[PDB]
């Protein structure tokens, strides 16, 4: 309602980005590209599209990217030993990767 025009603007932005770099003259692909990527079947296909995990500290993909392993979202516990530190964890909050 108040946010419907925001997601319609994003859907139309993706639609125009798809229609711009088509280099099209024939075969009429814009009818299907305006049937799928414009109406609210795009949200049905977006909920159909899976793969995300929203990681924090565990991306297995830098290690030889053709590797279908496990990725974690669990920031570690604070080390009790005084001295060394890591994980960007005691301040200055961090963004979450997604794989």
């Amino acid at each position: 309602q108040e946010l419907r025009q925001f997601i319609e603007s994003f859907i139309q932005e993706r639609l125009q980005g798809k229609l711009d770099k088509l280099q099209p003259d024939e075969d009429d692909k814009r009818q299907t590209l305006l049937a799928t990527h414009r109406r609210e079947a795009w949200l049905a296909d977006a909920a159909r599209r899976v793969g995300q995990l929203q990681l924090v500290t565990h991306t297995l993909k830098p290690i030889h990217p053709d590797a279908r392993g496990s990725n974690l979202h669990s920031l570690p516990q604070a080390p009790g030993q005084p001295g060394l530190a890591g994980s960007h964890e005691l301040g200055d909050r961090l963004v979450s990767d997604v794989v």
Partner: protein, 305 residues
Amino acid sequence: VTDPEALLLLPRLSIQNANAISSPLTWGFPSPGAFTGFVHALQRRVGISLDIELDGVGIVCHRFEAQISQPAGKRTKVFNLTRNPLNRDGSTAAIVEEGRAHLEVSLLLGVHGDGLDDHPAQEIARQVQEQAGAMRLAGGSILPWCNERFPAPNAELLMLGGSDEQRRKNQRRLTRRLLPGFALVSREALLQQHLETLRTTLPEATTLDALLDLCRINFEPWQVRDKPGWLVPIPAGYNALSPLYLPGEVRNARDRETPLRFVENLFGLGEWLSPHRVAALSDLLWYHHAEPDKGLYRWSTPRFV
């Protein structure tokens, strides 16, 4: 209680393709975890036959030559990669970036066991050297001293094998053999000290170590601030993401008899001293510290200062 009674000195080993990548934040010299794992593999392959333990190891790095290049116009450096063969159909495969470096490092390691009274004088060190010649150190094949103008022997010095003047004499004749090198030391009290002088009503995330790695040329009423020694960042162990799993729980492990855990790197501060200001060569050795139901799979050089 981990105190050595001897110090087997392995001479200046040359390593042709090491791991110049050390950690997701640090590159350059390999991890001290590699050297502790190399000595633990040597104890697995040699030390049980002699009923001796091998705990602790030094690093000197007589020379270092990374395989990098400067992009012609930038202030950073990129890694000289290797070429992998084609995949299945004839196509150039996706490249992974492996950092390789030529090292030349001698290492002294602390013998601990009852398998020496006076019988293995210098055949225990010959056995350890002639078995460690067929091994790799950080991913790098140890080139085992081809036909040249000179050889390079090994040494075995005992702390109880000699009186006090002979103790310092043997320490001096030991440190003459590795004097152009640079001893690597874990410095965590210095990192916590620089943190708590830095932490004056402001927090931190990881800047306590990044501020000691850099070269700030700031102004105070240009000047430049100095650091004692080469204070470098080093990967000092791991930390627990996951609770540890049973051996028959994680798919695709290395083996199905060891518990597995998912870990993150940990980061600390190291120094490259010269080994003529160590004040006890029974220090300067890298030991493990598990505390395994917490995480904290650390390696360090304790008993230093």
